């Protein structure tokens, strides 16, 4: 009921498809950042939304800037997210699986680097 995900200095996650077992009450994402760049240069987060909401979350988040960890304050389209991290840092987020609809289309992504392709899928199986 948890996953360890890495974001690197090349704006890649080390996975692009998360499966959430239906037996899980909660799900945990453990985000880390290999490499050698600070958070104000090459910062990463982990953000969950529906596929439909992703573009708008990313656009509004980018425009909110670093100080706001590239997320629009109190964004209702964000199901779950970590904080923004630099190299050698880590952060975890846990959410209620009850917030997911089984078999539906969810995307995960880093908000400042989604446009560079830092994204993948998540499915309640
Ligand atoms: Cu990123």
Q: Obtained via which technique? A: X-ray
Resolution of this structure in Å: 2.2
Q: Which domain holds residue 83?
A: 1-125
Residues 97, 92: Cα–Cα separation, whole Å: 16
Residues within 5 A (CB) of ion ligand 1: 44, 110, 113, 118
Query: Quick one: which of 106, 117, 110 has its CA closest to 19?
Result: 106
Q: Distance, CA 23 to ligand 1 centroid (Å)?
A: 30
* Number of domains forming the structure of the chain: 1
Residues 45, 86: Cα–Cα separation, whole Å: 9
Check which CATH number belongs to the domain holding 125 and give it. Answer: 2.60.40.420
Three-state DSSP state, 2: strand
44 is in an annotated binding site: yes
Instruction: Please give the structure tokens belonging to residue 78.
Output: 């964000």
Q: Distance, CA 83 to ligand 1 centroid (Å)?
A: 11
């Amino acid at each position: 009921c948890s996953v360890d995900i890495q974001g690197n200095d090349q704006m890649q996650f080390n996975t692009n498809a998360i499966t959430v077992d239906k037996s899980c009450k909660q799900f945990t994402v453990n985000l880390s950042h290999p490499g050698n760049l600070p958070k104000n240069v090459m910062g990463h987060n982990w953000v969950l939304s529906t596929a439909a909401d992703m573009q708008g979350v990313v656009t509004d988040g980018m425009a909110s800037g670093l100080d706001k960890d590239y997320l629009k304050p109190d964004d209702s389209r964000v199901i779950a997210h970590t904080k923004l991290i630099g190299s050698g840092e880590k952060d975890s987020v846990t959410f209620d699986v009850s917030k997911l609809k089984e078999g539906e289309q969810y995307m995960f992504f880093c908000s400042p680097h989604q446009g560079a392709g830092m994204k993948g899928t998540l499915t309640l199986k």
